[PDB]
Design a protein around this ligand. Structure first.
Ligand SMILES: Nc1nc(=O)c2ncc(C(=O)NCC(=O)NCC(=O)O)nc2[nH]1
Length: 263
């Protein structure tokens, strides 16, 4: 019943990847909520369970496939299926726990990790930070195999977590930020994997605050500037939503949009 978007790393190109990310964004947002030309994800409050998740089916050159479940309210990867087993991150709360029971209902083995799925926790388990984990088509091809072999003991916990960190950034973060999609395009185009630089990391870390700053802005102007980093790690101040239009594709829902007057 939940929509499925397919992607394969086998023979992937900039175009096939772009088609994928565009389709993901299309299933995450409804078009009911756009502010400053930037789409907002569905409000969690009052969202019917039948509209809560989307599924991303990943296949690779090794002919393996796994299916990620994303929460439409935040684009968060909440768990995955590989064959006869499903694995879910430790839910943040009771309502989320009930919600995930609606996923992969006929899977014969259901597990809930004892740990959550945030970067901080995954980086601890992986023994590596995002800044030291290479991204690109190769890493994603490898991540898909790693997730597929987890149930049989073939994949060590550190490698599982590393693989999650790769999937989340190449799918969820790419969907959230055209900038990050663009970074992954580059790596795919030249088939050259590489770790995310500070421009990627700071955007990832700031998504929630950027969403709030935009939605709370006065006609687009931030009350308090947000500091990001450029590629070389130097500071870049954001004062206004305008500079983010080419950069951020989707925001998390924070406030209802105030009334909009025409002077
Ligand atoms: N599983 C998972 N899916 C995601 O899309 C995701 N996307 C982002 C993060 C993440 O830690 N972001 C930074 C952070 O501090 N998050 C918590 C917050 O500030 O609200 N973690 C994720 N984990």
């Amino acid at each position: 019943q939940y929509p499925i978007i397919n992607f394969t790393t086998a023979g992937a190109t900039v175009q096939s990847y772009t088609n994928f990310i565009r389709a993901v964004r299309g299933r995450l947002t409804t078009g009911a909520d756009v502010r400053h030309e930037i789409p907002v994800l569905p409000n969690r409050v009052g969202l019917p369970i039948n509209q809560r998740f989307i599924l991303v089916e990943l296949s690779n050159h090794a002919e393996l496939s796994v299916t990620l479940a994303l929460d439409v309210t935040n684009a968060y990867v909440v768990g995955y299926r590989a064959g006869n087993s499903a694995y879910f991150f430790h839910p943040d709360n009771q309502e989320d726990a009930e919600a995930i029971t609606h996923l992969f209902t006929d899977v014969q083995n259901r597990y809930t990790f004892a740990f959550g799925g945030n970067y901080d926790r995954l980086e601890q388990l992986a023994g590596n930070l995002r800044e030291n984990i290479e991204l690109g088509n190769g890493p994603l091809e490898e991540a898909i195999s790693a997730l597929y072999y987890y149930s049989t003991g073939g994949t060590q916990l550190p490698t599982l977590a590393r693989s999650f960190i790769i999937c989340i950034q190449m799918i969820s973060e790419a969907a959230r930020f055209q900038y990050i999609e663009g970074e992954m395009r580059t790596r795919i185009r030249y088939n050259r994997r590489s770790a995310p630089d500070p421009s990627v990391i700071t955007l990832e870390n700031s998504w929630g605050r950027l969403s709030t700053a935009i939605q709370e802005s006065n006609q687009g102007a931030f009350a308090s500037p947000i500091q990001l980093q450029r590629r070389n790690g130097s500071k870049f101040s954001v004062y206004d939503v305008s500079i983010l239009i080419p950069i951020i594709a989707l925001m998390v829902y924070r406030c209802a949009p105030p009334p909009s007057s025409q002077f």
